[model samples]
Target chain A: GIVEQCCTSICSLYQLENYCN
Target chain B: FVNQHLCGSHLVEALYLVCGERGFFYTPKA
Candidate 1:
């Protein structure tokens, strides 16, 4: 899913552990 | 404001692309 993929990518970039989780 | 800014710019674009290609469906609750 692009939503999940993009979110994970952005979260990883910004170091958003909560979002990544 | 950064969250809203990023959401408006980046997330909106991403959603546009996804919705444009595959479209979407939703149901509303009353």
Candidate 2:
């Protein structure tokens, strides 16, 4: 079982640790 | 079929939508 997810949508100052690594 | 359908989108939120397995986030879906 392998799960993967990646999402990116910025506008309101885009935070989330700047999209990490 | 078709690689189990990847790349999904439809976030019409105008504010924010974060999730680090449930973190601090905000969205216009309330």
Candidate 3:
């Protein structure tokens, strides 16, 4: 859900990837 | 758990305690 800010934080992940398998 | 957010954020960790720590956390462990 935070893919846009992935580079800003380690916990940041793509919205689709966060929920998708 | 920013009360103890020593590092950063704690997804489910509310306050200085973890979410799974115990229901009493929200009620204040006092």
How many residue pairs collide in each prediction? 0, 1, 1
Per-residue alpha-carbon lDDT of model 2 for A1-21, expressed as tens digits? 011322232222233323323
Model 1 C-alpha lDDT per residue in residues A1-21, reported as the tens digit of each score: 323434433423232222321
Which pairs of residues collide in model 1?
Answer: none
Instruction: Give the share of true interchain contacts found in each model.
Output: 0.00, 0.02, 0.00
**Candidate 1: residue A19 lDDT (0-100):** 31
Q: What ordering of candidates by lDDT runs from best to worst?
A: 1, 2, 3
Candidate 2 lDDT over B1-30, as tens digits, reads: 112211234221211243343343332222
Question: Can you give the lDDT of residue B17 in candidate 3?
Answer: 36
Question: Which segments of candidate 3 are over 4 A away from where they belong?
Answer: A12-17, B1-30
- The whole-model lDDT of each prediction reads 0.35, 0.27, 0.27
Task: Report clash pairs, candidate 3.
Answer: A1-A15
Candidate 1 C-alpha lDDT tens digits along B1-30 = 022222334754534444564553321110
In model 3 chain B, where is the ten-residue run with the lowest total lDDT?
B1-10
